[PDB]
Design a protein around this ligand. Structure first.
Ligand code: MET
Length: 531
C-alpha cells in the first residue's frame, strides 16, 4: 500500500529546558524521514512537547509561574532548539492544542463504548517524574532531595509515592493474548531485537489493568477532563500517546501551523506510524499500552517501534549540578552541525549507551569526515587531477575497476536495508566501508601520476572515483544534509539527480557534466588539532 511514510519522535516533557537526549531522539526521527524523502516518498515527520500532568504542573509551581505561561515558554525553547539544530520536521505538536484535546476525547469515548473502561481503584506506587505506575518489585530504598530515606524507582532512580485513588481503569489485562499474537506475527515490530524480547517476557508474565484517570486535585487541574466526568482527568500518558493520532489528522499550512482537524485519519493517509522513535526509558507505554489502546478502539497498529539508549560524557552522567554538561548547539558551533550529527549517529547504535568526548569526536571528524570523505572529494575535483573540470568518459574497465564498481552498485541495496531496520549506524558504516575502498583504489591507481603518463587511463579512474563519491554522498545525505549539498555543487551534480531511487544506479550522471566552480580557500571539513 502507498501511503505517507509516517515517522515520529516522542513528545517531550516541558518541565525543563531541552538537552541532548531530546535532540538525539529528534535527530533519529529527522534522519529516517529524510532518507524516505530522498527515495522520493511522501513523508510526515512529527515531534513535539508533552505539556500536561503533575510533573509539569509542579515544575511550573517551583518557578512560581502559571502552567499556561510556563508550558508556552519551554515549548518555545524546544522549537528554537530544533530550528537551530536544522532538522526537517513537518509539524511540532503541543498537547495543549485544542484539536489534540478533541482527539483525546474521541479516543476515550471509543475505549468506553467498547467496554474497556470501568471505575476502580489504584492503590500502589507511582513515579511522578516518570508519570509511571510501578509494582513493589520495581522500587527500592533511596534518598530524596532532603537527605531523608525514601523509596525510589528501580527503572529511573526517581522518588516514588503511594497513591490510593478511585480511578477509571483500562482493561489491559484483557489484551495479553492479542498483544502476544501481534509480537509473534510481526517479529520486526520492535527494534532492537533484545528490547523486543524484554517486551514479550513482560507480557508473558501477565498484565494488570491500567489507571487511565486521576482525581483532578492530584493534577492541579492541569490535564484533559474525562468526558462525562469533570472530577477526573485523563492519564497524561493516554493523553500523550494520542499525539501520534492527532498528528496524523492535522492539515498543516506551509508556515507549519495546524489549520484543520479531519474526522477520519485515512483522509490524510499517515496513520498508523511506520516508525515510532523512542528512548529505552519509555518502552512499555509504546509497546504495550499504545497497541492495547489501539486494539480496543479498533485502530491500526504501528509498523515499528525503535528504542535507542541513554548518553554519557566521559563515562559519566550528564547534569549541570554534577558538573558535566554537553550542550548540542555549543558543540555544533565548535565542530559543525552536520559533523556533530554524524558523530551522534556513528558513535552509538541502539543497543549501546554511547560515549561523547572531544577527543573521540575530533578523531572521527579528522579520521572519517576529513581524511576519508573530504580528502576524496578534493582529489576527484582538483585542478591538478581533473584538469578539464568535468566528468570524463570512461575507457575499458579492468578487473580492479570492476571490483570497485560492484561495491558501489551493491551499496544502495545494503544501505537501504539498514535504514529500514532502522539501524542508522550500520548504514553509515556501510557507506564509509565503500569510501575506504575508493580511497585505496585511488592510492593504488595514482591518478596524479596518470595525468602525465596515461590520460586515457586517468579518464576511467576519475570517472569511477566521481561516481563512487556521488553515490556515497547521496546515501549519506540524510546524515549530512548541508554538506551533501556542498559536495554535489562541487561535483556539479544537477538537482534532479540529487534525489530518487533512479539516482541510486551507477552512471546516472552523464560524462561531460561540468564540475561546479571552485573557491581559493574552501574545505568541506577542516581538521581540528589535538590539545
Ligand atoms: C508519547 S511520548 C511521551 C514521552 C514523555 N513526555 C517523556 O518525555 O519521556
Amino acid at each position: 500500500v502507498e501511503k505517507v511514510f509516517f515517522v515520529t519522535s516522542p513528545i517531550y516533557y516541558v518541565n525543563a529546558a531541552p538537552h541532548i537526549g531530546h535532540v538525539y531522539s529528534t535527530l533519529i526521527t529527522d534522519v529516517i524521514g529524510r532518507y524516505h524523502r530522498v527515495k522520493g516518498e511522501r513523508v510526515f515527520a512529527l515531534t513535539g512537547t508533552d505539556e500536561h500532568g503533575q510533573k509539569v504542573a509542579e515544575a511550573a509551581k517551583q518557578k512560581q509561574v502559571s502552567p499556561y505561561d510556563f508550558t508556552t515558554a519551554v515549548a518555545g525553547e524546544f522549537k528554537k532548539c530544533f530550528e537551530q539544530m536544522d532538522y526537517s520536521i513537518d509539524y511540532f505538536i503541543r498537547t495543549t492544542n485544542e484539536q489534540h484535546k478533541a482527539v483525546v476525547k474521541e479516543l476515550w469515548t471509543k475505549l468506553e463504548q467498547k467496554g474497556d473502561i470501568y471505575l476502580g481503584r489504584y492503590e500502589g506506587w507511582y513515579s511522578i517524574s516518570d508519570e509511571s505506575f510501578l509494582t513493589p518489585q520495581n522500587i527500592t530504598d533511596g534518598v530524596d532531595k532532603d537527605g531523608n530515606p525514601c523509596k525510589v524507582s528501580l527503572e529511573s532512580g526517581h522518588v516514588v509515592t503511594w497513591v490510593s485513588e478511585e480511578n477509571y481503569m483500562f482493561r489491559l489485562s484483557a489484551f495479553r493474548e492479542r498483544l502476544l499474537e501481534w509480537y509473534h506475527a510481526n517479529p520486526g515490530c520492535i527494534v532492537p531485537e533484545f528490547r523486543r524480547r524484554e517486551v514479550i517476557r513482560a507480557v508473558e508474565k501477565g498484565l494488570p489493568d491500567l489507571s487511565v484517570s486521576r482525581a483532578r486535585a492530584t493534577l492541579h487541574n492541569w490535564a484533559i477532563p474525562v468526558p462525562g466526568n469533570p472530577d477526573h482527568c485523563v492519564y497524561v500518558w493516554l493523553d500523550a500517546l494520542t499525539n501520534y493520532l492527532t498528528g496524523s489528522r492535522l492539515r498543516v499550512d506551509e508556515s507549519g501551523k495546524e489549520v484543520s482537524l479531519v474526522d477520519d485519519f485515512n483522509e490524510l493517509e499517515r496513520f498508523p506510524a511506520d516508525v515510532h522513535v523512542i528512548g529505552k526509558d519509555i518502552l512499555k507505554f509504546h509497546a504495550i499500552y499504545w497497541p492495547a489502546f489501539l486494539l480496543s478502539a479498533g485502530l491500526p497498529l504501528p509498523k515499528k517501534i525503535v528504542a535507542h539508549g541513554w548518553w554519557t560524557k566521559d563515562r559519566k552522567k550528564i547534569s549541570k549540578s554534577l558538573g558535566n554538561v554537553f550542550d548540542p548547539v555549543e558543540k555544533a558551533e565548535e565542530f559543525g552541525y552536520d559533523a556533530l550529527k554524524y558523530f551522534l549517529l556513528r558513535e552509538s547504535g541502539f543497543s549501546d549507551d554511547g560515549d561523547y568526548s572531544d577527543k573521540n569526536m575530533i578523531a572521527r571528524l579528522n579520521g572519517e569526515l576529513a581524511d576519508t570523505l573530504g580528502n576524496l572529494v578534493m582529489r576527484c575535483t582538483s585542478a591538478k587531477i581533473n584538469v578539464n573540470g568535468e566528468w570524463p568518459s570512461p575507457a575499458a574497465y579492468t578487473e580492479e575497476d570492476e571490483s570497485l564498481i560492484q561495491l558501489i552498485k551493491d551499496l544502495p541495496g545494503t544501505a537501504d536495508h539498514y535504514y529500514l531496520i532502522p539501524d542508522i549506524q550500520k548504514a553509515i558504516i556501510a557507506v564509509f566501508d565503500v569510501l575506504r575502498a575508493i580511497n585505496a583504489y585511488v592510492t593504488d591507481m595514482a591518478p596524479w601520476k596518470l595525468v602525465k603518463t596515461d590520460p586515457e587511463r586517468l579518464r576511467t579512474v576519475l570517472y569511477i572515483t566521481l561516481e563512487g563519491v556521488r553515490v556515497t554522498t547521496l546515501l549519506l545525505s540524510p546524515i549530512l544534509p548541508r554538506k551533501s549539498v556542498v559536495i554535489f555543487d562541487m561535483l556539479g551534480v544537477p538537482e534532479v539527480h540529487r534525489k530518487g531511487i533512479e539516482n541510486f544506479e551507477f552512471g546516472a550522471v552523464p560524462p561531460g557534466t561540468r564540475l561546479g566552480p571552485a573557491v581559493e580557500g574552501e574545505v568541506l571539513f577542516s581538521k581540528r588539532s589535538t590539545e
